[PDB]
């Protein structure tokens, strides 16, 4: 069961788009001015540990016109990596930032709360949750989440697949559903890994030599995590016949099907490969439109229900674990939903329906939604495109159950009133159980700076955070001295000293 360790899980959650944490690279400072800068950054960290400073810092950036919501994510994520030590403080930074968001939503519409990252705090609590719940995820939810992922992977390949458009016999989305049907026969060929023991692999005559290579690897390295698995671009498919076989087939070669501007890919049926063929994955030697089953340029309820119906098995289970009352309420959840309940009475909101959407767009629609949506956050796995369309349609099914109010709606319409029960059933425990003491809380928050193995990239985090400071320097000086306590703290000068320490 390929579980990503905390380092990977966190990096992938805080820094998603780049794939790998951009906090892994050297500062880009020469050996000469190298020690003079390294020191300055340290003083930036001590400056950040001032709740008085930090609050003003973010508030100034949020107001800037040039500060995109893309920066809002990066700044929250850098700050998360930065304050990974002072977690007790990181929570206080949020405790304070939450109360600020609360007052701002009273004027316009309080129901629209925590919908889009138009604020930096919206990202910090997704990061916050992730830090807290990582244990729980690995410990309980991990299991059915992996199950559903293997289940979907399996159930899709029991049907043909177009290596070009990206459509299959099975999915939960018409925008991805393979409308046309093709002539496909099932193959079950003995696969060898000659990089020598033979593992039987189940492909389909229609699969390209590429898809067939992947399907082969999936069995030849069943429980080996992606990073431990070798690269497929280093591998070549080699068929075997008679005394000495030896024939290296490929996706596109001498035997490719050119039809003017339409060149087809090479399949197993294309080469006349039979059942039980000895195929070995051996190392690599080294404007016509490409196609496979349907050349590129209404619902089909019946087709999707077969797929839903297969996957229901673990769909039920995954939700029955996330929304579990049988297990006790994790402290991070209970604390937070009571952190909101403390805020609800401070501004006078008796309406629990307004409270629920702040509660929903916190833990499930902030956190749980993402893990269902994207499983590459917990598992060292390669996620298919059609896989994601399926998973997303399971996340939009879970989501419709969370919130009190197309395909996904009148598809799971049978199970959606069942999950709506589970949501309320879960929020019953949230209030009925013993509230979590802050004395008892920071006890857990400290052991998380402990159990966080190493440096997630804090060096770069401070340098990258200074890259921001450097651009918005003066606008910061404004809030640095317009405040009375900020003058007393000598914050302005503290910053100035660091500013010169870098340059």
């Amino acid at each position: 069961i390929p579980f990503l360790d905390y380092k990977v899980y966190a990096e992938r959650i805080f820094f998603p788009g780049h794939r790998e944490s951009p906090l892994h690279r050297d500062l880009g400072v020469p050996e000469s001015r190298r020690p003079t800068v390294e020191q300055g950054l340290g003083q930036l960290s001590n400056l950040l540990n001032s709740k008085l400073f930090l609050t003003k810092f973010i508030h100034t950036l949020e107001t800037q016109r040039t500060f995109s919501a893309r920066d809002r994510a990066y700044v929250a994520s850098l700050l998360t990596v930065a304050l990974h030590g002072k977690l007790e403080y990181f929570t206080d930074i949020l405790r304070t930032l939450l109360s600020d968001l609360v007052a701002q939503y009273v004027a316009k519409n309080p129901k629209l709360m925590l919908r889009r990252t138009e604020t930096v705090v919206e990202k910090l609590l997704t990061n916050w949750m992730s830090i807290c719940l990582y244990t729980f995820v690995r410990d309980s939810v991990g299991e059915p989440l992996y199950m559903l992922f293997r289940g979907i992977k399996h159930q899709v390949d029991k049907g043909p697949v177009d290596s070009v458009t990206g459509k299959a016999k099975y999915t939960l989305n018409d925008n991805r559903l393979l409308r046309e049907d093709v002539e496909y026969r099932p193959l079950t060929l003995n696969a060898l890994l000659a990089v020598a023991q033979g593992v039987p692999v189940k492909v389909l005559d229609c699969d390209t030599i590429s898809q067939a290579k992947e399907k082969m690897l999936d069995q030849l390295y069943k429980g080996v995590p992606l990073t431990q698995r070798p690269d497929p671009r280093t591998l070549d498919v080699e068929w075997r016949s008679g005394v000495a076989g030896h024939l290296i087939l490929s996706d596109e070669d001498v035997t490719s099907e050119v039809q003017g501007l339409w060149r087809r890919l090479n399949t197993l049926q294309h080469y006349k490969v039979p059942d039980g063929a000895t195929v070995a994955l051996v190392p690599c030697l080294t404007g016509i439109r490409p196609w496979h089953l349907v050349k590129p340029s209404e619902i089909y309820l019946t087709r999707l229900l077969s797929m839903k119906g297969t996957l229901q098995k673990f769909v039920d289970d995954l939700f029955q674990v996330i929304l579990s009352t049988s297990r006790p309420v994790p402290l991070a959840v209970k604390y937070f939903f009571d952190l909101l309940d403390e805020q609800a009475q401070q501004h006078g909101i008796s309406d629990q329906d307004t409270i629920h959407i702040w509660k929903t767009n916190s833990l499930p629609l902030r956190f749980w939604i993402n893990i269902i949506k994207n499983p590459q956050f917990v598992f060292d796995v390669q996620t298919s495109d059609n896989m994601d369309a399926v998973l997303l349609v399971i996340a939009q099914t879970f989501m419709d159950a969370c919130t009190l109010a197309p395909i996904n709606k009148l598809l799971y319409a049978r199970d959606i009133p069942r999950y709506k029960r589970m949501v309320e059933r879960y929020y019953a425990d949230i209030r009925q159980t013993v509230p979590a003491s802050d004395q008892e809380m920071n006890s857990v928050l400290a052991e998380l700076s402990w159990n966080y193995s190493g440096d997630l990239g804090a060096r770069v985090a401070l340098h990258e955070l200074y890259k921001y400071i450097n651009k918005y320097y003066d606008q910061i000086i404004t809030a640095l001295e317009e405040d009375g306590t900020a003058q007393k703290m000598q914050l302005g000068y503290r910053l100035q000293q660091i500013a010169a320490a870098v340059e």
């Binding site: 008679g242 005394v243 000495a244 024939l247 035997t255």
Partner: protein, 178 residues
């Protein structure tokens, strides 16, 4: 140490697999099974020089045609085949084989080879030939074919007897060296 890649392309059941096996084991197969893409190996001595002959069997069926071109790259010497006991297998030399070979490899030397020599001289075989109103291939019929295609030699042989089969490959080794 010079290695010679030799590909034997020939019509359905001309006796390639058999002639390839006979040369490398000095034993005849017996049973017919249509070959897909089989590889053979032999270490020879021609004019006081050691050579590794890396043989390549191919198909004589239109079914395994979508795959045959893969055997072709970097071939040092080709072996275009036919059976002396069928002119159908001989006419397909000018029709299927020669065109296919040169379409890909325009420099590789060809050697037209007449397999099943033992059956040509047999009476009982000529009886079946006469029944479908046909006559077997002779040395001048084949020598006219080899000069026509641009073959570097014409060799007649048989796999069950090993008659002039030794020569067939020794000549193919010579066909590379100059």
């Amino acid at each position: 140490m010079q290695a010679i890649k030799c590909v034997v392309v020939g019509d359905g059941a001309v006796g390639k697999t058999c002639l390839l096996i006979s040369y490398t084991t000095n034993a005849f197969p017996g049973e017919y099974i249509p070959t897909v893409f089989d590889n053979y190996s032999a270490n020879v001595m021609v004019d006081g020089k050691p050579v590794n002959l890396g043989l390549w069997d191919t198909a004589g069926q239109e079914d395994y045609d979508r795959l045959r071109p893969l055997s072709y790259p970097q071939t040092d010497v080709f072996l275009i085949c036919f059976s002396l006991v069928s002119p159908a297998s001989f006419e397909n030399v000018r029709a299927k084989w020669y065109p296919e070979v040169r379409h890909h490899c325009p420099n590789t030397p060809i050697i037209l080879v007449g397999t099943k020599l033992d059956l040509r001289d047999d009476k009982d075989t000529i009886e079946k030939l006469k029944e479908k109103k046909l006559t077997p291939i002779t040395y001048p019929q084949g020598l006219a074919m080899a000069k026509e295609i641009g073959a570097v030699k014409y060799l007649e042989c048989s796999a069950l007897t090993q008659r002039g089969l030794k020569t067939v490959f020794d000549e193919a080794i010579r066909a590379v060296l100059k």
